[PDB]
Amino acid sequence: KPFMPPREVHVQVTHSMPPQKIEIFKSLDNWAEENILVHLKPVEKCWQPQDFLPDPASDGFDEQVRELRERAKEIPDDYFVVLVGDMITEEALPTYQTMLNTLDGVRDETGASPTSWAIWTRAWTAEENRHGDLLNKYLYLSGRVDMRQIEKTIQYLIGSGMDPRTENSPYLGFIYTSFQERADFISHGNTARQAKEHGDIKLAQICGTIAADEKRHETAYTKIVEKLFEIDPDGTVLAFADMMRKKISMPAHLMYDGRDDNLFDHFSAVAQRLGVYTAKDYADILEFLVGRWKVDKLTGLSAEGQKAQDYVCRLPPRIRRLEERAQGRAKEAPTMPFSWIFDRQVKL
Amino acid sequence: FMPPREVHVQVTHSMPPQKIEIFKSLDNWAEENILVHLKPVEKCWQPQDFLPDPASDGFDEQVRELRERAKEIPDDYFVVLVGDMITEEALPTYQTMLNTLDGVRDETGASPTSWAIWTRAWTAEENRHGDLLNKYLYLSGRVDMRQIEKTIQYLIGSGMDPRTENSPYLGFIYTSFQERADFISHGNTARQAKEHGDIKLAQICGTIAADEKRHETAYTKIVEKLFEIDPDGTVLAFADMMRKKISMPAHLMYDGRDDNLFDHFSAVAQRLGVYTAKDYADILEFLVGRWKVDKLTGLSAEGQKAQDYVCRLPPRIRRLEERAQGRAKEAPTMPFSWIFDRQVKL
Ligand SMILES: [Fe+3]
Ligand SMILES: [Fe+3]
Ligand SMILES: [Fe+3]
Ligand SMILES: [Fe+3]
Numbered sequence: 077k078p079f080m081p082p083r084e085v086h087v088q089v090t091h092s093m094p095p096q097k098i099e100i101f102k103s104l105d106n107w108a109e110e111n112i113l114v115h116l117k118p119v120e121k122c123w124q125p126q127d128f129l130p131d132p133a134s135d136g137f138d139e140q141v142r143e144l145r146e147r148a149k150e151i152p153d154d155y156f157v158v159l160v161g162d163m164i165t166e167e168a169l170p171t172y173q174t175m176l177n178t179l180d181g182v183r184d185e186t187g188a189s190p191t192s193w194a195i196w197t198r199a200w201t202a203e204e205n206r207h208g209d210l211l212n213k214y215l216y217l218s219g220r221v222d223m224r225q226i227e228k229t230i231q232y233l234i235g236s237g238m239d240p241r242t243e244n245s246p247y248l249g250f251i252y253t254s255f256q257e258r259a260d261f262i263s264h265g266n267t268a269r270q271a272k273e274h275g276d277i278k279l280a281q282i283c284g285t286i287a288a289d290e291k292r293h294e295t296a297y298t299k300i301v302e303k304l305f306e307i308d309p310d311g312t313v314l315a316f317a318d319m320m321r322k323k324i325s326m327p328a329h330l331m332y333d334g335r336d337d338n339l340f341d342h343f344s345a346v347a348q349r350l351g352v353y354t355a356k357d358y359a360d361i362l363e364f365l366v367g368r369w370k371v372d373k374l375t376g377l378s379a380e381g382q383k384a385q386d387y388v389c390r391l392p393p394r395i396r397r398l399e400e401r402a403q404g405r406a407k408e409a410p411t412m413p414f415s416w417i418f419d420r421q422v423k424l
Numbered sequence: 425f426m427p428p429r430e431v432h433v434q435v436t437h438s439m440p441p442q443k444i445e446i447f448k449s450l451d452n453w454a455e456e457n458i459l460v461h462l463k464p465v466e467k468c469w470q471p472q473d474f475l476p477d478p479a480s481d482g483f484d485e486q487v488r489e490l491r492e493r494a495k496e497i498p499d500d501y502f503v504v505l506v507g508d509m510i511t512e513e514a515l516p517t518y519q520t521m522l523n524t525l526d527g528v529r530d531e532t533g534a535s536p537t538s539w540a541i542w543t544r545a546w547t548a549e550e551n552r553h554g555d556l557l558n559k560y561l562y563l564s565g566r567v568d569m570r571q572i573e574k575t576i577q578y579l580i581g582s583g584m585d586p587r588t589e590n591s592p593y594l595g596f597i598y599t600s601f602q603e604r605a606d607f608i609s610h611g612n613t614a615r616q617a618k619e620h621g622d623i624k625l626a627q628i629c630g631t632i633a634a635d636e637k638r639h640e641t642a643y644t645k646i647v648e649k650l651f652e653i654d655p656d657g658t659v660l661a662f663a664d665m666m667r668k669k670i671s672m673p674a675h676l677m678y679d680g681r682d683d684n685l686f687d688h689f690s691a692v693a694q695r696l697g698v699y700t701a702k703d704y705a706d707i708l709e710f711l712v713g714r715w716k717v718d719k720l721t722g723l724s725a726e727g728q729k730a731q732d733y734v735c736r737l738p739p740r741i742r743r744l745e746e747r748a749q750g751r752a753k754e755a756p757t758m759p760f761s762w763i764f765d766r767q768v769k770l
Contacts, residue, residue: 079466083534090531119581120425120680124573132491132565133764141487170516170547174533177520185436185590187521188429188583188676201516202580206573212555213562219478227470227552234548235465235541237534244531330534334466418479 081232081332082340084239086322092243093180100307101181101193101246107303108192115296116199117289125210128282130217141217147276148218153417155267155274156220158352160416161343162263163211164226165328166204168233172327173201175240179249200293207286214282225415229333236330241322247315250300255324257294258361261287263353270352302369309374310381316371317384320362320391333415342412345424348402349409355399363392427578427678428686430585432668438589439526446653447527447539447592453649454538461642462545463635471556474628476563487563493622494564499768501613501620502566504698506762507689508609509557510572511674512550514579518673519547521586525595546639553632560628571761575679582676587668593661596646601670603640604707607633609699616698648715655720656727662717663730666708666737679761688758691770694748695755701745709738 130140176197177183184194215221242248268283304312331340347353366372372389374381413419476486522543523529530540561567588594614629650658677686693699712718718735720727759765 079464088532088535118425119574119577122574122577124570124577126569126573129562129569132562133568137565167551170519170551171533171544173516174519174523174530177523178531178533184520184583185524186434186585187517187524188585189434194583198517198583199581202577205513205516205576205580209558209573213559216475216478216559219483222479223475224470224472227472227555228465230551231465231468231470231548234551235545237530237540237544239532239534 079334081236082330082337083236084330086239086241088239089241089243091180093245093247095180097308097311098181104303105192108196108300111299111303112196112296113192113199115292115299116196116203117292119202122203123206123285125206125213128210128278128285129213144214144217144278145219147279148220151220151271151274151276151279153220153420154346154350154422155270156215156218156417157343157414157422158263158347158350159211159267160215160221160226161328161331161347162267163208163215164229164233164331165326166208166211167230168238168328169201169204169208171234171237172204173197174237175242175327176200176249176253178244179242179246180244181246182249196296200296203289203293207289210282210286214279221416222418225333225418229331229339229416232332232334233328233330236332238325238327238330240325240327241319245315247304247312248319250297250304251316251319252324254294254297254301254365255319255361256327257290257297258364259326259353259357261290261294262357262361263347264290266352270350298365298368305369305371305374309376310378313371313374313377313381313384313388316369317387320388324358335415342414342424345405345409346422349406349423355402356396359392359395359399362388362395366392425680427582428676428683429582430676432585432587434585435587435589437526439591439593441526443654443657444527450649451538454542454646457645457649458542458642459538459545461638461645462542462549463638465548468549469552469631471552471559474556474624474631475559490560490563490624491565493625494566497566497617497620497622497625499566499763499766500692500696501616502561502564502763503689503760503768504609504693504696505557505613506561506567506572507674507677507693508613509554509561510575510579510677511672512554512557513576514584514674515547515550515554517580517583518550519543521584521588521673522546522595522599524590525588525592526590528592528595542642546642549635549639553635556628556632560625567762568764571679571764575677575685575762578678578680579674579676582678584671584673584676586671586673587665591661593650593658594665596643596650597662597665598670600640600643600647600711601665601707602673603636603643604710605672605699605703607636607640608703608707609693610636612698616696644711644714647711651715651717651720655722656724659717659720659723659727659730659734662711662715663733666734670704681761688760688770691751691755692768695752695769701748702742705738705741705745708741712738 130137182193240252264283264287268280271280271283329340409424411421412424413421528539586598588598610629610633614626617626675686755770757767758770759767
């Protein structure tokens with residue numbers, strides 16, 4: 077069957093958090109306005125996409141665009157595939173603002189709510205917007221990729237949305253985004269350092285600068301979970317385990333270009349192979365968070381909390397060993413065409 | 425370095441909670457009268473269709489022709505065009521605006537409901553508008569992308585409160601009005617884009633306008649339906665929006681230099697005849713006729729005051745914001761950071 081995007085294969089579960097716990101967040105408003113909002117960079121001090129692109133109001137514009145394209149010839153298709161996937165993930169931004177606005181105690185109820193929570197969501201969104209913009213124009217000018225197939229993938233992606241399975245729970249929500257932000261920090265950070273190798277400093281600065289925005293986001297979301305562990309170590313420990321069993325699905329897992337039915341798997345494979353984001357990175361993030369939130373040092377947990385706590389502390393090495401042995405899928409990986417690069421083929 | 429803020433008290437969940445069912449019921453209906461107005465992905469235009477092709481040997485000359493044409497387009501017009509583009513780029517805010525509506529919100533981010541499906545596909549459609557105008561302005565060299573990017577970040581941080589109070593009634597009235605506004609602005613920049621000598625730019629604006637009409641058509645069929653099922657609540661919602669006035673999605677525009685950026689942008693749009701105080705009236709009047717407000721009967725003493733107010737507001741607005749004496753002729757010249765502080769006539 078033709079033009080059918082992939083769908084979420086799990087049953088939709090809404091409003092799992094007990095409705096009384098909504099007050100905890102109303103209470104933490106002030107706290108958020110002092111421990112969280114402080115991780116937003118004020119607009120006037122933020123970089124903008126133009127800072128890293130050829131200046132179209134400068135006599136230098138032509139040579140700049142020309143050097144950009146020359147450099148891009150020395151960057152192999154493999155890398156463009158990954159980079160394209162990252163950029164597409166970024167452009168599906170409106171979905172992610174919705175992701176935060178689904179959380180019970182934290183949603184923006186009007187579109188301009190004076191709450192600390194709604195203020196964060198809006199400013200976080202505003203920061204994220206520059207990531208897509210910048211990688212978009214870069215890919216556009218490069219000439220190495222097929223902007224029409226990329227634009228088409230993006231429209232499929234927004235139509236599809238995503239269900240991270242947070243069930244409207246600020247607990248699950250902020251656990252989720254804590255994990256994703258770090259993942260984003262690793263991918264972008266990796267494309268950055270790798271971007272230097274292939275011979276493009278400017279592209280490295282681009283990726284690096286996006287990475288730095290991610291760290292700050294991670295820091296912000298991790299202070300919230302930390303705080304939730306402090307206030308409710310039982311609910312939070314339980315929320316943490318729940319997310320992991322479910323597995324953290326990536327925001328663009330429903331990726332579809334109208335040709336490949338396994339586009340996300342394929343994109344990911346290349347990212348894995350290239351060492352941009354690996355099955356191992358997923359583990360390191362998990363382990364980091366376990367240590368960062370002091371899950372192990374938690375005491376006075378219900379028989380429920382204890383099973384959860386133990387599960388979470390012993391999942392990283394289990395995931396490690398298992399999705400370690402890249403025997404039958406790393407070496408014998410077939411070559412595959414991607415419509416994002418005009419059906420040129422790269423090694424999966 | 426303070427962005428403007430909504431000056432009105434925040435009013436949430438005004439629609440009676442029982443009326444949430446009306447929408448759950450209309451799911452199938454929506455999947456046959458609304459979703460039909462979305463263009464399937466494979467058949468949609470994409471920004472690359474109207475831009476220089478960067479994987480073509482023709483790229484250079486195409487970028488070069490684009491820039492040459494843009495020199496013949498005056499600063500006035502770039503101001504308006506930039507404002508339009510900025511409004512488009514604040515898209516995530518508008519998805520949120522629809523996700524705030526009580527009986528229609530997407531509860532997960534991927535809800536199989538007709539309502540959530542529409543919201544997501546409408547958003548996907550809108551996204552190409554921003555992308556296209558963005559790359560156009562970027563290649564043009566006529567405008568200061570850094571100041572524009574900064575305005576955009578202020579705008580999303582600010583969001584907007586259209587004062588729909590989570591009511592699908594108010595919501596879809598609102599978006600019915602906006603879509604038509606959008607169709608007029610884009611439509612006008614389109615025809616005017618021809619004058620100044622740029623066909624391609626006209627095709628860009630025109631293609632955006634067409635998207636808008638379809639959206640308008642879709643939102644209008646919902647209100648029509650609401651008038652049919654609940655002529656009282658709908659008539660009352662329609663009047664409520666108008667007293668409050670329909671505020672534009674980008675009214676909290678801020679670039680870090682101008683404290684009246686939206687007013688100023690609008691002034692230029694007005695003067696240029698892209699979107700005028702008169703257009704606002706014509707949209708209103710059209711909707712009054714399109715929804716058959718006047719032909720409504722059996723309304724409460726409440727419904728009737730409302731019905732009358734709405735049918736007599738267009739000419740009142742007309743005459744009033746007609747006489748552009750003290751503000752059209754003696755309009756001062758003002759610098760915009762979007763064009764490197766070059767100045768245009770307000
Ligand atoms: Fe990002
Ligand atoms: Fe981020
Ligand atoms: Fe639009
Ligand atoms: Fe529209």
